[PDB]
PDB file of C-alpha atoms in Angstrom:
ATOM      1  CA  UNK P   1      50.484 -48.677 -12.779  1.00 13.64           C
ATOM      2  CA  UNK P   2      53.762 -49.672 -14.500  1.00 13.17           C
ATOM      3  CA  UNK P   3      55.876 -51.374 -11.915  1.00 18.40           C
ATOM      4  CA  UNK P   4      53.564 -54.259 -11.547  1.00 18.15           C
ATOM      5  CA  UNK P   5      54.187 -57.493 -12.747  1.00 20.19           C
ATOM      6  CA  UNK P   6      51.308 -58.666 -15.228  1.00 21.71           C
ATOM      7  CA  UNK P   7      50.232 -61.694 -13.094  1.00 20.11           C
ATOM      8  CA  UNK P   8      46.469 -61.405 -14.084  1.00 17.36           C
ATOM      9  CA  UNK P   9      46.984 -60.205 -17.782  1.00 19.59           C
ATOM     10  CA  UNK P  10      45.780 -63.302 -19.318  1.00 21.83           C
ATOM     11  CA  UNK P  11      42.875 -64.087 -16.595  1.00 22.75           C
ATOM     12  CA  UNK P  12      39.245 -64.226 -17.873  1.00 19.22           C
ATOM     13  CA  UNK P  13      37.037 -61.283 -16.573  1.00 19.13           C
ATOM     14  CA  UNK P  14      33.670 -62.274 -15.468  1.00 21.62           C
ATOM     15  CA  UNK P  15      32.142 -58.974 -13.974  1.00 20.73           C
ATOM     16  CA  UNK P  16      29.898 -59.764 -10.755  1.00 18.49           C
ATOM     17  CA  UNK P  17      26.889 -57.473 -10.270  1.00 16.12           C
ATOM     18  CA  UNK P  18      28.365 -54.795  -7.912  1.00 17.72           C
ATOM     19  CA  UNK P  19      27.154 -51.854  -5.711  1.00 16.41           C
ATOM     20  CA  UNK P  20      28.853 -49.742  -3.437  1.00 15.61           C
ATOM     21  CA  UNK P  21      27.095 -49.646  -0.157  1.00 14.40           C
ATOM     22  CA  UNK P  22      29.084 -47.040   1.537  1.00 12.82           C
ATOM     23  CA  UNK P  23      32.122 -44.464   1.320  1.00 15.08           C
ATOM     24  CA  UNK P  24      34.723 -43.085   3.505  1.00 12.30           C
ATOM     25  CA  UNK P  25      36.860 -40.111   2.824  1.00 13.26           C
ATOM     26  CA  UNK P  26      40.020 -40.476   0.603  1.00 13.32           C
ATOM     27  CA  UNK P  27      42.954 -41.560   2.801  1.00 14.59           C
ATOM     28  CA  UNK P  28      40.832 -44.085   4.954  1.00 13.84           C
ATOM     29  CA  UNK P  29      42.510 -47.308   5.268  1.00 16.57           C
ATOM     30  CA  UNK P  30      39.930 -49.879   5.675  1.00 16.65           C
ATOM     31  CA  UNK P  31      41.769 -52.988   6.530  1.00 11.92           C
ATOM     32  CA  UNK P  32      39.345 -55.632   7.363  1.00  8.90           C
ATOM     33  CA  UNK P  33      35.553 -56.494   7.940  1.00 10.51           C
ATOM     34  CA  UNK P  34      33.271 -59.222   9.495  1.00  4.95           C
ATOM     35  CA  UNK P  35      29.582 -59.429   9.041  1.00  5.40           C
ATOM     36  CA  UNK P  36      27.127 -59.698  11.853  1.00  5.94           C
ATOM     37  CA  UNK P  37      24.164 -62.271  11.704  1.00  9.61           C
ATOM     38  CA  UNK P  38      21.639 -59.399  11.623  1.00  9.71           C
ATOM     39  CA  UNK P  39      23.043 -57.796   8.538  1.00  5.37           C
ATOM     40  CA  UNK P  40      25.286 -55.361  10.122  1.00 10.09           C
ATOM     41  CA  UNK P  41      28.888 -55.126   8.625  1.00 10.75           C
ATOM     42  CA  UNK P  42      32.055 -53.933  11.015  1.00  9.46           C
ATOM     43  CA  UNK P  43      34.961 -52.469   9.372  1.00 11.23           C
ATOM     44  CA  UNK P  44      38.577 -51.426  10.821  1.00  8.49           C
ATOM     45  CA  UNK P  45      39.124 -48.061   9.783  1.00  8.01           C
ATOM     46  CA  UNK P  46      43.100 -48.637  10.495  1.00  9.93           C
ATOM     47  CA  UNK P  47      44.824 -45.247  11.054  1.00 10.64           C
ATOM     48  CA  UNK P  48      42.233 -43.966  13.533  1.00 12.88           C
ATOM     49  CA  UNK P  49      41.669 -47.227  15.533  1.00 13.82           C
ATOM     50  CA  UNK P  50      37.872 -47.129  14.870  1.00 15.91           C
ATOM     51  CA  UNK P  51      35.573 -50.128  14.462  1.00 15.13           C
ATOM     52  CA  UNK P  52      32.805 -48.724  12.319  1.00 15.89           C
ATOM     53  CA  UNK P  53      29.346 -50.425  12.012  1.00 15.70           C
ATOM     54  CA  UNK P  54      27.609 -50.110   8.525  1.00 20.38           C
ATOM     55  CA  UNK P  55      23.922 -50.637   8.190  1.00 20.09           C
ATOM     56  CA  UNK P  56      22.385 -52.068   5.030  1.00 19.44           C
ATOM     57  CA  UNK P  57      21.205 -48.601   3.830  1.00 19.35           C
ATOM     58  CA  UNK P  58      24.992 -47.442   4.061  1.00 22.41           C
ATOM     59  CA  UNK P  59      24.710 -45.365   7.384  1.00 20.90           C
ATOM     60  CA  UNK P  60      27.948 -45.574   9.511  1.00 21.61           C
ATOM     61  CA  UNK P  61      28.355 -45.271  13.096  1.00 20.56           C
ATOM     62  CA  UNK P  62      31.710 -45.573  15.282  1.00 19.11           C
ATOM     63  CA  UNK P  63      31.209 -48.757  17.149  1.00 19.52           C
ATOM     64  CA  UNK P  64      34.220 -48.617  18.969  1.00 16.72           C
ATOM     65  CA  UNK P  65      37.623 -46.932  19.262  1.00 15.54           C
ATOM     66  CA  UNK P  66      41.027 -48.622  20.177  1.00 13.41           C
ATOM     67  CA  UNK P  67      44.258 -47.060  21.496  1.00 12.31           C
ATOM     68  CA  UNK P  68      46.492 -47.051  18.346  1.00 11.33           C
ATOM     69  CA  UNK P  69      45.499 -48.860  14.847  1.00 10.66           C
ATOM     70  CA  UNK P  70      43.279 -51.660  14.207  1.00 11.98           C
ATOM     71  CA  UNK P  71      43.271 -54.351  11.530  1.00 12.25           C
ATOM     72  CA  UNK P  72      41.974 -57.894  11.705  1.00  9.03           C
ATOM     73  CA  UNK P  73      38.423 -58.644  13.251  1.00 11.06           C
ATOM     74  CA  UNK P  74      36.796 -61.801  14.035  1.00  9.84           C
ATOM     75  CA  UNK P  75      33.387 -62.629  16.032  1.00  6.09           C
ATOM     76  CA  UNK P  76      33.290 -64.581  19.088  1.00  6.83           C
ATOM     77  CA  UNK P  77      30.643 -66.921  20.160  1.00  4.81           C
ATOM     78  CA  UNK P  78      28.974 -64.364  22.462  1.00  4.16           C
ATOM     79  CA  UNK P  79      28.787 -61.611  19.535  1.00  5.41           C
ATOM     80  CA  UNK P  80      31.815 -59.676  20.808  1.00  3.72           C
ATOM     81  CA  UNK P  81      34.658 -58.723  18.596  1.00  3.87           C
ATOM     82  CA  UNK P  82      38.352 -59.920  18.625  1.00  3.80           C
ATOM     83  CA  UNK P  83      40.729 -57.487  17.036  1.00  2.00           C
ATOM     84  CA  UNK P  84      44.190 -57.241  15.963  1.00  2.00           C
ATOM     85  CA  UNK P  85      46.314 -53.979  15.852  1.00  2.00           C
ATOM     86  CA  UNK P  86      49.060 -51.985  17.195  1.00  2.00           C
ATOM     87  CA  UNK P  87      49.177 -49.836  20.461  1.00  2.00           C
ATOM     88  CA  UNK P  88      50.535 -46.429  20.773  1.00  2.00           C
ATOM     89  CA  UNK P  89      53.661 -47.694  20.731  1.00  2.00           C
ATOM     90  CA  UNK P  90      53.460 -49.828  17.560  1.00  2.00           C
ATOM     91  CA  UNK P  91      53.543 -53.014  19.639  1.00  2.00           C
ATOM     92  CA  UNK P  92      51.021 -55.849  18.442  1.00  2.00           C
ATOM     93  CA  UNK P  93      47.985 -55.986  20.271  1.00  2.00           C
ATOM     94  CA  UNK P  94      44.664 -58.542  20.593  1.00  2.00           C
ATOM     95  CA  UNK P  95      41.596 -56.627  21.935  1.00  2.00           C
ATOM     96  CA  UNK P  96      38.224 -57.751  22.896  1.00  2.00           C
ATOM     97  CA  UNK P  97      35.398 -55.345  21.554  1.00  2.00           C
ATOM     98  CA  UNK P  98      32.116 -55.889  23.612  1.00  2.00           C
ATOM     99  CA  UNK P  99      28.847 -55.359  21.745  1.00  2.00           C
ATOM    100  CA  UNK P 100      28.327 -52.288  24.061  1.00  2.00           C
ATOM    101  CA  UNK P 101      31.550 -50.430  22.368  1.00  2.00           C
ATOM    102  CA  UNK P 102      33.759 -51.266  25.403  1.00  2.00           C
ATOM    103  CA  UNK P 103      37.365 -52.270  24.459  1.00  2.00           C
ATOM    104  CA  UNK P 104      39.532 -54.524  26.739  1.00  2.00           C
ATOM    105  CA  UNK P 105      43.191 -55.256  25.884  1.00  2.00           C
ATOM    106  CA  UNK P 106      43.864 -59.159  25.920  1.00  2.00           C
ATOM    107  CA  UNK P 107      47.324 -59.335  25.007  1.00  2.00           C
ATOM    108  CA  UNK P 108      50.226 -57.258  24.237  1.00  2.49           C
ATOM    109  CA  UNK P 109      52.803 -59.104  22.081  1.00  3.02           C
ATOM    110  CA  UNK P 110      56.243 -57.638  21.678  1.00  6.08           C
ATOM    111  CA  UNK P 111      57.581 -60.985  20.103  1.00  7.73           C
ATOM    112  CA  UNK P 112      55.251 -60.265  17.308  1.00  5.50           C
ATOM    113  CA  UNK P 113      55.586 -57.496  14.589  1.00  5.89           C
ATOM    114  CA  UNK P 114      52.497 -57.085  12.798  1.00  4.87           C
ATOM    115  CA  UNK P 115      49.355 -59.069  13.477  1.00  3.85           C
ATOM    116  CA  UNK P 116      47.054 -58.961  10.303  1.00  4.29           C
ATOM    117  CA  UNK P 117      44.237 -61.152   9.599  1.00  4.42           C
ATOM    118  CA  UNK P 118      42.676 -63.210  12.430  1.00  2.93           C
ATOM    119  CA  UNK P 119      40.092 -66.099  12.002  1.00  2.00           C
ATOM    120  CA  UNK P 120      38.593 -68.511  14.216  1.00  2.00           C
ATOM    121  CA  UNK P 121      39.964 -72.159  14.958  1.00  2.00           C
ATOM    122  CA  UNK P 122      37.482 -73.313  17.374  1.00  2.00           C
ATOM    123  CA  UNK P 123      35.205 -71.723  20.203  1.00  2.00           C
ATOM    124  CA  UNK P 124      37.799 -69.862  22.205  1.00  2.00           C
ATOM    125  CA  UNK P 125      40.703 -70.172  19.868  1.00  2.00           C
ATOM    126  CA  UNK P 126      41.835 -67.911  16.956  1.00  2.00           C
ATOM    127  CA  UNK P 127      44.803 -67.860  14.544  1.00  2.00           C
ATOM    128  CA  UNK P 128      46.285 -64.542  13.435  1.00  2.00           C
ATOM    129  CA  UNK P 129      49.172 -63.987  10.735  1.00  2.00           C
ATOM    130  CA  UNK P 130      52.178 -62.049  11.547  1.00  2.00           C
ATOM    131  CA  UNK P 131      53.012 -60.313   8.423  1.00  2.00           C
ATOM    132  CA  UNK P 132      56.711 -59.635   9.339  1.00  2.00           C
ATOM    133  CA  UNK P 133      57.866 -62.340  11.673  1.00  2.00           C
ATOM    134  CA  UNK P 134      56.820 -65.504   9.469  1.00  2.00           C
ATOM    135  CA  UNK P 135      54.592 -66.989  11.948  1.00  2.85           C
ATOM    136  CA  UNK P 136      50.832 -67.920  12.824  1.00  3.32           C
ATOM    137  CA  UNK P 137      50.032 -67.090  16.245  1.00  3.02           C
ATOM    138  CA  UNK P 138      47.309 -69.050  18.140  1.00  5.43           C
ATOM    139  CA  UNK P 139      45.044 -66.743  20.470  1.00  8.49           C
ATOM    140  CA  UNK P 140      42.744 -68.108  23.074  1.00 10.73           C
ATOM    141  CA  UNK P 141      40.449 -65.355  24.018  1.00 10.34           C
ATOM    142  CA  UNK P 142      38.937 -66.780  27.278  1.00 12.63           C
ATOM    143  CA  UNK P 143      42.054 -67.375  29.477  1.00 12.24           C
ATOM    144  CA  UNK P 144      43.655 -65.121  27.450  1.00 15.19           C
ATOM    145  CA  UNK P 145      46.871 -66.591  26.158  1.00 15.86           C
ATOM    146  CA  UNK P 146      49.132 -66.328  22.798  1.00 15.05           C
ATOM    147  CA  UNK P 147      51.570 -68.742  21.378  1.00 14.66           C
ATOM    148  CA  UNK P 148      53.230 -69.602  18.193  1.00 14.29           C
ATOM    149  CA  UNK P 149      50.946 -71.948  16.064  1.00 14.83           C
ATOM    150  CA  UNK P 150      53.378 -72.207  13.311  1.00 17.00           C
ATOM    151  CA  UNK P 151      56.729 -70.626  12.353  1.00 15.57           C
ATOM    152  CA  UNK P 152      57.902 -71.327   8.917  1.00 13.73           C
ATOM    153  CA  UNK P 153      59.706 -69.884   5.971  1.00 16.86           C
ATOM    154  CA  UNK P 154      56.455 -69.962   3.613  1.00 18.38           C
ATOM    155  CA  UNK P 155      55.030 -67.375   6.081  1.00 20.05           C
ATOM    156  CA  UNK P 156      57.830 -65.060   5.816  1.00 18.30           C
ATOM    157  CA  UNK P 157      59.072 -62.473   3.592  1.00 15.41           C
ATOM    158  CA  UNK P 158      61.490 -63.410   0.788  1.00 10.14           C
ATOM    159  CA  UNK P 159      63.422 -60.088   1.827  1.00 11.99           C
ATOM    160  CA  UNK P 160      63.926 -59.878   5.644  1.00 12.84           C
ATOM    161  CA  UNK P 161      64.255 -55.785   4.882  1.00 10.45           C
ATOM    162  CA  UNK P 162      61.193 -55.493   2.548  1.00  7.29           C
ATOM    163  CA  UNK P 163      58.232 -53.545   3.877  1.00  6.58           C
ATOM    164  CA  UNK P 164      55.556 -55.489   2.193  1.00  5.16           C
ATOM    165  CA  UNK P 165      53.679 -57.894   4.310  1.00  6.12           C
ATOM    166  CA  UNK P 166      54.015 -61.646   3.872  1.00  5.06           C
ATOM    167  CA  UNK P 167      51.725 -63.941   5.783  1.00  3.15           C
ATOM    168  CA  UNK P 168      48.443 -61.727   5.815  1.00  5.40           C
ATOM    169  CA  UNK P 169      44.976 -63.230   5.234  1.00  2.31           C
ATOM    170  CA  UNK P 170      43.964 -66.706   6.636  1.00  2.33           C
ATOM    171  CA  UNK P 171      40.700 -68.563   6.337  1.00  3.87           C
ATOM    172  CA  UNK P 172      39.783 -72.298   7.261  1.00  2.38           C
ATOM    173  CA  UNK P 173      38.033 -74.542   4.526  1.00  2.20           C
ATOM    174  CA  UNK P 174      37.654 -78.209   5.039  1.00  2.61           C
ATOM    175  CA  UNK P 175      40.756 -79.578   6.913  1.00  2.00           C
ATOM    176  CA  UNK P 176      43.182 -76.887   5.672  1.00  2.00           C
ATOM    177  CA  UNK P 177      44.136 -73.241   6.654  1.00  2.00           C
ATOM    178  CA  UNK P 178      44.598 -70.969   3.515  1.00  2.00           C
ATOM    179  CA  UNK P 179      47.170 -68.075   4.010  1.00  2.00           C
ATOM    180  CA  UNK P 180      48.123 -65.436   1.858  1.00  2.00           C
ATOM    181  CA  UNK P 181      51.814 -64.507   1.634  1.00  2.00           C
ATOM    182  CA  UNK P 182      51.476 -61.135  -0.236  1.00  2.00           C
ATOM    183  CA  UNK P 183      55.111 -60.413  -0.554  1.00  2.00           C
ATOM    184  CA  UNK P 184      56.015 -63.620  -1.986  1.00  2.10           C
ATOM    185  CA  UNK P 185      52.828 -63.448  -4.239  1.00  2.00           C
ATOM    186  CA  UNK P 186      51.578 -66.844  -2.903  1.00  2.00           C
ATOM    187  CA  UNK P 187      48.471 -68.423  -1.373  1.00  2.00           C
ATOM    188  CA  UNK P 188      49.502 -71.715   0.630  1.00  2.00           C
ATOM    189  CA  UNK P 189      47.522 -74.146   2.203  1.00  2.00           C
ATOM    190  CA  UNK P 190      48.289 -75.799   5.845  1.00  2.00           C
ATOM    191  CA  UNK P 191      46.836 -79.243   7.007  1.00  2.00           C
ATOM    192  CA  UNK P 192      44.957 -78.804  10.292  1.00  2.00           C
ATOM    193  CA  UNK P 193      44.669 -82.045  12.226  1.00  2.00           C
ATOM    194  CA  UNK P 194      42.164 -83.420  14.693  1.00  2.00           C
ATOM    195  CA  UNK P 195      44.015 -81.734  17.526  1.00  2.00           C
ATOM    196  CA  UNK P 196      43.908 -78.615  15.422  1.00  2.00           C
ATOM    197  CA  UNK P 197      47.650 -78.468  15.003  1.00  2.02           C
ATOM    198  CA  UNK P 198      49.460 -77.692  11.727  1.00  5.37           C
ATOM    199  CA  UNK P 199      50.831 -80.138   9.238  1.00  8.28           C
ATOM    200  CA  UNK P 200      53.515 -79.093   6.515  1.00  4.25           C
ATOM    201  CA  UNK P 201      52.707 -75.969   4.512  1.00  4.10           C
ATOM    202  CA  UNK P 202      52.168 -76.435   0.972  1.00  6.24           C
ATOM    203  CA  UNK P 203      52.161 -74.058  -1.967  1.00  7.10           C
ATOM    204  CA  UNK P 204      48.549 -73.669  -3.598  1.00 10.16           C
ATOM    205  CA  UNK P 205      48.875 -70.971  -5.840  1.00 10.66           C
ATOM    206  CA  UNK P 206      51.944 -68.822  -7.016  1.00 11.97           C
ATOM    207  CA  UNK P 207      52.077 -65.372  -8.823  1.00 11.17           C
ATOM    208  CA  UNK P 208      48.965 -64.066  -7.221  1.00  7.06           C
ATOM    209  CA  UNK P 209      48.860 -61.117  -5.117  1.00  6.99           C
ATOM    210  CA  UNK P 210      46.028 -61.276  -2.517  1.00  9.52           C
ATOM    211  CA  UNK P 211      45.450 -59.532   0.628  1.00  6.58           C
ATOM    212  CA  UNK P 212      42.518 -60.926   2.494  1.00  4.81           C
ATOM    213  CA  UNK P 213      40.129 -63.420   1.191  1.00  7.31           C
ATOM    214  CA  UNK P 214      37.015 -65.574   1.915  1.00  9.95           C
ATOM    215  CA  UNK P 215      35.529 -68.610   0.807  1.00  9.91           C
ATOM    216  CA  UNK P 216      32.198 -69.841  -0.564  1.00  8.30           C
ATOM    217  CA  UNK P 217      30.593 -73.458   0.521  1.00  7.34           C
ATOM    218  CA  UNK P 218      32.049 -74.869  -2.789  1.00  4.23           C
ATOM    219  CA  UNK P 219      35.543 -73.905  -2.181  1.00  2.00           C
ATOM    220  CA  UNK P 220      36.093 -70.797  -4.200  1.00  2.00           C
ATOM    221  CA  UNK P 221      38.587 -68.372  -2.738  1.00  2.00           C
ATOM    222  CA  UNK P 222      37.335 -64.506  -3.388  1.00  2.00           C
ATOM    223  CA  UNK P 223      40.506 -62.489  -2.815  1.00  2.00           C
ATOM    224  CA  UNK P 224      41.250 -58.856  -2.691  1.00  2.00           C
ATOM    225  CA  UNK P 225      44.133 -57.823  -4.711  1.00  2.00           C
ATOM    226  CA  UNK P 226      45.005 -54.453  -3.241  1.00  2.00           C
ATOM    227  CA  UNK P 227      47.304 -52.654  -5.656  1.00  2.00           C
ATOM    228  CA  UNK P 228      46.067 -54.593  -8.511  1.00  2.00           C
ATOM    229  CA  UNK P 229      42.574 -52.866  -7.804  1.00  2.00           C
ATOM    230  CA  UNK P 230      40.633 -56.080  -8.326  1.00  2.00           C
ATOM    231  CA  UNK P 231      38.713 -59.163  -6.761  1.00  2.00           C
ATOM    232  CA  UNK P 232      39.621 -62.386  -8.128  1.00  2.00           C
ATOM    233  CA  UNK P 233      37.903 -65.777  -7.808  1.00  2.00           C
ATOM    234  CA  UNK P 234      39.962 -68.666  -7.359  1.00  2.19           C
ATOM    235  CA  UNK P 235      38.630 -72.136  -7.893  1.00  2.00           C
ATOM    236  CA  UNK P 236      39.568 -75.321  -6.390  1.00  2.18           C
ATOM    237  CA  UNK P 237      41.328 -76.179  -9.702  1.00  3.70           C
ATOM    238  CA  UNK P 238      43.600 -73.281  -9.053  1.00  3.42           C
ATOM    239  CA  UNK P 239      42.110 -71.401 -12.107  1.00  2.18           C
ATOM    240  CA  UNK P 240      41.694 -67.554 -11.563  1.00  4.87           C
ATOM    241  CA  UNK P 241      38.903 -65.312 -12.865  1.00  4.11           C
ATOM    242  CA  UNK P 242      38.973 -61.409 -12.454  1.00  3.15           C
ATOM    243  CA  UNK P 243      35.307 -60.474 -10.931  1.00  5.70           C
ATOM    244  CA  UNK P 244      35.755 -56.921 -10.242  1.00  7.60           C
ATOM    245  CA  UNK P 245      38.080 -53.907 -11.203  1.00  5.75           C
ATOM    246  CA  UNK P 246      38.198 -50.474 -10.761  1.00  5.23           C
ATOM    247  CA  UNK P 247      35.114 -49.290 -12.277  1.00  2.00           C
ATOM    248  CA  UNK P 248      33.335 -51.640  -9.780  1.00  2.83           C
ATOM    249  CA  UNK P 249      34.752 -49.871  -6.716  1.00  2.00           C
ATOM    250  CA  UNK P 250      37.517 -51.997  -5.725  1.00  3.44           C
ATOM    251  CA  UNK P 251      40.662 -49.915  -6.204  1.00  2.00           C
ATOM    252  CA  UNK P 252      42.755 -51.009  -3.311  1.00  2.00           C
ATOM    253  CA  UNK P 253      40.783 -53.659  -2.368  1.00  2.00           C
ATOM    254  CA  UNK P 254      41.799 -55.245   1.285  1.00  2.00           C
ATOM    255  CA  UNK P 255      39.457 -57.695   2.230  1.00  2.00           C
ATOM    256  CA  UNK P 256      36.574 -59.798   1.638  1.00  2.00           C
ATOM    257  CA  UNK P 257      33.410 -61.295   3.653  1.00  2.00           C
ATOM    258  CA  UNK P 258      30.309 -62.898   2.692  1.00  2.00           C
ATOM    259  CA  UNK P 259      26.960 -61.771   4.073  1.00  2.00           C
ATOM    260  CA  UNK P 260      24.898 -63.932   6.200  1.00  2.00           C
ATOM    261  CA  UNK P 261      21.233 -63.313   5.984  1.00  2.00           C
ATOM    262  CA  UNK P 262      18.518 -64.256   3.507  1.00  2.00           C
ATOM    263  CA  UNK P 263      19.054 -61.020   1.704  1.00  2.00           C
ATOM    264  CA  UNK P 264      22.793 -61.315   0.927  1.00  2.00           C
ATOM    265  CA  UNK P 265      23.855 -64.981   1.759  1.00  2.00           C
ATOM    266  CA  UNK P 266      25.493 -65.036  -1.835  1.00  2.00           C
ATOM    267  CA  UNK P 267      27.048 -61.550  -1.802  1.00  2.00           C
ATOM    268  CA  UNK P 268      30.669 -60.652  -0.696  1.00  2.84           C
ATOM    269  CA  UNK P 269      31.291 -57.468   0.813  1.00  2.41           C
ATOM    270  CA  UNK P 270      34.983 -55.776   0.044  1.00  2.93           C
ATOM    271  CA  UNK P 271      36.587 -53.196   1.983  1.00  3.86           C
ATOM    272  CA  UNK P 272      39.176 -50.849   0.110  1.00  2.00           C
ATOM    273  CA  UNK P 273      41.641 -47.885   0.841  1.00  2.00           C
ATOM    274  CA  UNK P 274      40.811 -46.231  -2.541  1.00  2.00           C
ATOM    275  CA  UNK P 275      44.442 -46.796  -3.715  1.00  2.00           C
ATOM    276  CA  UNK P 276      46.290 -44.924  -0.983  1.00  6.23           C
ATOM    277  CA  UNK P 277      49.638 -47.300  -1.522  1.00  5.67           C
ATOM    278  CA  UNK P 278      49.896 -47.438  -5.194  1.00  3.52           C
ATOM    279  CA  UNK P 279      47.206 -45.262  -6.893  1.00  2.00           C
ATOM    280  CA  UNK P 280      45.947 -46.165 -10.150  1.00  2.00           C
ATOM    281  CA  UNK P 281      46.847 -43.660 -13.100  1.00  3.96           C
ATOM    282  CA  UNK P 282      43.301 -41.900 -12.439  1.00  5.19           C
ATOM    283  CA  UNK P 283      44.302 -41.310  -8.712  1.00  4.76           C
ATOM    284  CA  UNK P 284      43.038 -42.242  -5.402  1.00  3.89           C
ATOM    285  CA  UNK P 285      39.316 -42.535  -4.551  1.00  2.00           C
ATOM    286  CA  UNK P 286      37.141 -42.537  -1.556  1.00  2.80           C
ATOM    287  CA  UNK P 287      37.585 -45.669   0.299  1.00  2.12           C
ATOM    288  CA  UNK P 288      34.578 -48.101  -0.363  1.00  2.00           C
ATOM    289  CA  UNK P 289      32.387 -50.906   1.066  1.00  2.18           C
ATOM    290  CA  UNK P 290      31.401 -52.923  -2.269  1.00  3.68           C
ATOM    291  CA  UNK P 291      28.754 -55.569  -2.507  1.00  5.96           C
ATOM    292  CA  UNK P 292      29.457 -58.194  -5.028  1.00  3.83           C
ATOM    293  CA  UNK P 293      26.831 -60.894  -6.144  1.00  5.43           C
ATOM    294  CA  UNK P 294      28.714 -64.228  -6.613  1.00  7.62           C
ATOM    295  CA  UNK P 295      25.548 -66.633  -6.438  1.00  7.28           C
ATOM    296  CA  UNK P 296      27.137 -68.987  -3.946  1.00  8.81           C
ATOM    297  CA  UNK P 297      26.749 -68.954  -0.256  1.00  8.20           C
ATOM    298  CA  UNK P 298      29.652 -68.166   2.054  1.00  7.00           C
ATOM    299  CA  UNK P 299      31.762 -70.855   4.171  1.00 12.54           C
ATOM    300  CA  UNK P 300      31.039 -70.347   7.936  1.00 13.24           C
ATOM    301  CA  UNK P 301      33.708 -68.625   9.825  1.00 15.65           C
ATOM    302  CA  UNK P 302      32.378 -69.760  13.479  1.00 13.11           C
TER     303      UNK P 302
END
């Protein structure tokens, strides 16, 4: 579509083996996903507040339903899920979704605006990106408790009145936390010290549009580009390859997660919204979970 800066115009395309695992109706906003050690993929169907489980054959069942909207997902050590979203009043909430489908609200956070990606920091602690405040929150799920882990302009929108999300997805790799700032079109990295506190954020890659992403064990970052309708692989040397495009089912790609099992240890799963925000010329499509074979195992999230 013609508005878009041609940021990936000269990147090589190396198309991964792709397969659509399941599809949702047009206008389904799948925001994120997390894989279970048994093979089950949970996704967030944002607008309806549903956490949906997907079997390998592609069958869907509504695992849980939150009040309001639901975005980020991470597994806890007990096999429950921590979720970010909004309550009925559009206030950020962190929820715990138990394996029996029951929901408890851990925290309501009116000093936050939009909690997006969430990822484990330790056994009981998780970091979540606030896409409009310019901060990462530290969430303890056992107490529970919330605080500001880092507030910094690199996590913020360039324009204080822009509606595009800034700090968005976040993942640990090595002694760093990598964070997408979609609105500035940046990937940054933040040192994590021995006491799990942040150092000085550093720009990692510029002119890249990444929603959420995931790492392999070699430190390749696999990122969903959303309005660019692609999945890119960014190597530790900062070089970028396009590994899936519209035809592979990734129009409006939003997030990425590796499988954990013998059968899919080397595959990523990608959720999409079928292009609802900025449709391609051919129009919107049903929202997908797409499996891409990448030939390298996933970094453990914990």
